[PDB]
Amino acid sequence: KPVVAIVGRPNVGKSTIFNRIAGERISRIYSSAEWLNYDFNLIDPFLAQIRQQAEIAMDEADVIIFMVNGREGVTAADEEVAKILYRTKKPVVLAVNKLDNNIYDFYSLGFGEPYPISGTHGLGLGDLLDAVAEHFKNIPETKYNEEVIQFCLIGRPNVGKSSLVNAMLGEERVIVSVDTSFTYNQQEFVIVDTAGMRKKGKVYETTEKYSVLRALKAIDRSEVVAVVLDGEEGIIEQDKRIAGYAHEAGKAVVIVVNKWDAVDKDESTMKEFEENIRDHFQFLDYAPILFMSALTKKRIHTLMPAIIKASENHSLRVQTNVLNDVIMDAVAMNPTPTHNGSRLKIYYATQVSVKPPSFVVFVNDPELMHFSYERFLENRIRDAFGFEGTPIKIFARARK
Numbered sequence: 001k002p003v004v005a006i007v008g009r010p011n012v013g014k015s016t017i018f019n020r021i022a023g024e025r026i027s028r029i030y031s032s033a034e035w036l037n038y039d040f041n042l043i044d045p046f047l048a049q050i051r052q053q054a055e056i057a058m059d060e061a062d063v064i065i066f067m068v069n070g071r072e073g074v075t076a077a078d079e080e081v082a083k084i085l086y087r088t089k090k091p092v093v094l095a096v097n098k099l100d101n102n103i104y105d106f107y108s109l110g111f112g113e114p115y116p117i118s119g120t121h122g123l124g125l126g127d128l129l130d131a132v133a134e135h136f137k138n139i140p141e142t143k144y145n146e147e148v149i150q151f152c153l154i155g156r157p158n159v160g161k162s163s164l165v166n167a168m169l170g171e172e173r174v175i176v177s178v179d180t181s182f183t184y185n186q187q188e189f190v191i192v193d194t195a196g197m198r199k200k201g202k203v204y205e206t207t208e209k210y211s212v213l214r215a216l217k218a219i220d221r222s223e224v225v226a227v228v229l230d231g232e233e234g235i236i237e238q239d240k241r242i243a244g245y246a247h248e249a250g251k252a253v254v255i256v257v258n259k260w261d262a263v264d265k266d267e268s269t270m271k272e273f274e275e276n277i278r279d280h281f282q283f284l285d286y287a288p289i290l291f292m293s294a295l296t297k298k299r300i301h302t303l304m305p306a307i308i309k310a311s312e313n314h315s316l317r318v319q320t321n322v323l324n325d326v327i328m329d330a331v332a333m334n335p336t337p338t339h340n341g342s343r344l345k346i347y348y349a350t351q352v353s354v355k356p357p358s359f360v361v362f363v364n365d366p367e368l369m370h371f372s373y374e375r376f377l378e379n380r381i382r383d384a385f386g387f388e389g390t391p392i393k394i395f396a397r398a399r400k
């Protein structure tokens, strides 16, 4: 059922690896071999023909193996493959072939951990396939075009979720075509699981636990999550746990306060509500807070742009040289701590993934990096690049 593709410039050993992991052809496409305790299927100038084959993988596969040649190091040819493979939200696992038994900066290709393999004698193959297979559980049931931005609204019953959607969809900039499809400024969007939020009126709400769980599945399926709070009734414990789940899952978040028409708006009421939110949702300092009214339509026009902005940052891919300049600047600004007699050293940093943006800093010892300092590095990356609306992950790793 899961489909796997091997992509890379010619002469990296794709065919050799393919033939090994491929069993027989199917009633074009191949099933995985018997020697594998994993069940899946396989799919079979310079730029022109790389681009075509890469775009077949990005179109047909669920997981892509990006293969390079360990004997050569990173070629400029490999770099153009990488640049093309940035175009997909589909998981890419990096395979460094022809290492019959010294992996550095393949990281530099920006897909994180390289997996050293050998078509020769299956060395490193267990690890590669484990990494490929980990992504299987996350393969979407409902599959939309890559261009589509999927998002969801969540919040307690009668916050105004249905009302927001309708006001939003009633805008001049929108064309509407279990999920709801539409375009805004001609960009394709999907609101995940709009059936779930409109199940009231069909059905009495006897408990909230199924709705909670059903909302977590929509979050799993989304890239941006709109956490909608009730301006009138204020914040509650249920709001934090779900927002907590969204943040933990690495989703872009925007916080929406609805029913703002119904609040006794003194000059400072908004700032106070903003501060209250920051205090209760301390893990969402990246998420912007939008005040609006689904009823009077005040500031409804600000929602979509925030969702767009948050989706962009969520999938933002930084250039390495700039990233390293930013981290050096930070260490120069704020020298690294000493943890039990030894000082932390940072050598290099690269982005390893998007959605959310994740970075690996190579260090002396990941133990010596305090969480506070990791938080400090996070803030300087944000200062430099923006990243509003999305969490970022930072990992310390030992060279070697």
Ligand SMILES: Nc1nc2c(ncn2[C@@H]2O[C@H](COP(=O)(O)OP(=O)(O)O)[C@@H](O)[C@H]2O)c(=O)[nH]1
Pocket: 009, 010, 011, 012, 013, 014, 015, 016, 017, 097, 098, 099, 100, 117, 118, 119, 120, 121
């Ligand atoms: N040393 C070594 N050579 C390999 C390995 N895998 C493939 N080759 C050789 O590298 C060349 C490329 O093989 P092929 O599978 O056709 O690569 P492709 O161009 O990516 O399809 C062939 O001559 C293979 O014999 C490997 O793991 N180690």
Ligand SMILES: Nc1nc2c(ncn2[C@@H]2O[C@H](COP(=O)(O)OP(=O)(O)O)[C@@H](O)[C@H]2O)c(=O)[nH]1
Pocket: 156, 157, 158, 159, 160, 161, 162, 163, 164, 197, 258, 259, 260, 261, 262, 292, 293, 294, 295, 296
């Ligand atoms: N004052 C005010 N009432 C609202 C607003 N949005 C929704 N409501 C009301 O709150 C109730 C809940 O609306 P609904 O969209 O069904 O909540 P949902 O469960 O989140 O979908 C309805 O009576 C709405 O008329 C708003 O912006 N201001």
Ligand SMILES: [Zn+2]
Pocket: 337, 338, 339, 340, 370
């Ligand atoms: Zn310490």
